[PDB]
Amino acid sequence: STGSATTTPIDSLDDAYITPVQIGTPAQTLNLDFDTGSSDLWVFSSETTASEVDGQTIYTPSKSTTAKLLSGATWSISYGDGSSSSGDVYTDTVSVGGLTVTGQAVESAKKVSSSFTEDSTIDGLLGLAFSTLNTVSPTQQKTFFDNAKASLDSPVFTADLGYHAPGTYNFGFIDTTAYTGSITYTAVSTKQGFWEWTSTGYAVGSGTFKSTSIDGIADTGTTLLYLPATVVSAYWAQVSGAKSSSSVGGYVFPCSATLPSFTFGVGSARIVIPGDYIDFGPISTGSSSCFGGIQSSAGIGINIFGDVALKAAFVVFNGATTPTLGFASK
Ligand SMILES: CNCc1ccc(O)cc1
């Protein structure tokens, strides 16, 4: 089997991308944020505290003939930005892009934090990191990908995110029309439950490539590219008037600037992030200070190759017995 779904940016900055997902029978279609940095499939639901729901589409298990309470199971998760959600668990049929899983754990939110309520475009998250991070207790549950794997033609999914445009998530096959050149594969560590890999270095604009190992994760759920402070300072030093602002919470730059590209290494291959991808626009409506798309990972405890980086590439998440990541230009 295979599946193929279009993913669409939630706003004009590509803060996140939402992909339609069918849950239940008859289908209830919710727009979820596919997240390679977490391992829970959770939804706004008929159980979510009514004051915490503002415009999201909800899953109603009582209207699904295939929904079953997973008796006793609870879940609770927090994300890097201080947002969180928790609730109980149903099993139901879940389809993505034509690929169906029966008996998928669908984590129903009873509570969500403010930055979920305030985003009407995200109806939940679909985790695609390793199932060892799933928060369901007392019986940990599998991700949609881990449940689908045995049915797939090839144990892979691919992320092809758009810059200010829709893109595609594919399951079970590699669309050889979707990228240019060859895919370079690189080793993954699953020790922390993430798609963790080591980049071979970086360049800023037309500058020389610096060969240096940068451990990090491939995380579709993160907007920005979070790298060591050395690397980030080297990038922003090339933008006149850029500075790190404690008040704003990262590097800002004059909106009048033209940003340089950023290149990262994948083995002997190179992925070039155009400068335009690093612009996240005014810090506040009408400001002439703009927020940068490359930020320090100091204090996060991990480097994160988020959407700024991944949208520059065709990315293969190879879930074979020995997992690997692949990157191609496109
Ligand atoms: C913006 N805070 C809620 C949130 C949204 C999306 C996501 O991947 C994690 C957390």
Swiss-Prot record:
Belongs to the peptidase A1 family. It comes from the Eukaryota. Its EC number is 3.4.23.22. Keywords: Aspartyl protease, Disulfide bond, Hydrolase, Protease, Signal, Zymogen. The gene is EAPA. This is Endothiapepsin. One of its GO terms (molecular function) is aspartic-type endopeptidase activity. Disulfide bonds join 255-290. The keyword Protease applies. The active site is at residues 35, 199. It catalyses: Hydrolysis of proteins with specificity similar to that of pepsin A, prefers hydrophobic residues at P1 and P1', but does not cleave 14-Ala-|-Leu-15 in the B chain of insulin or Z-Glu-Tyr. Clots milk. It is an enzyme of class 3 (hydrolase).
